[PDB]
Amino acid sequence: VKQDMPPVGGYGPIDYKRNLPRRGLSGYSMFAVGIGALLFGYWSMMRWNRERRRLQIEDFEARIALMPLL
């Protein structure tokens, strides 16, 4: 006879339990990365703001030199 039957060795194991990976860095790592990015941005903004102040002083002194003719 022929009928719907599982095979001679049966069917294989089937996973039925939860599997969460558990991934990412430790919280100290992202805190250190954020703090380092903050410090780098602070340093770059400091340098560029000082340069901008120097350029503004230069432009203002050019204006002061140009004033009497106007």
Add this chain to the structure above:
Amino acid sequence: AMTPFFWMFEEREKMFEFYERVSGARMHAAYVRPGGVHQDLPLGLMDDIYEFS
């Protein structure tokens, strides 16, 4: 959250296809009857059930 609806309605459609193969209707099978069932399982269905599970 409207994404898992579309994520698992294809699995729901797969089981609807299993109902289709075993009884002949996608939803209203009328397969379980007093006295057992109405028809035997077709050949090759249980491999599909095992793969889906």
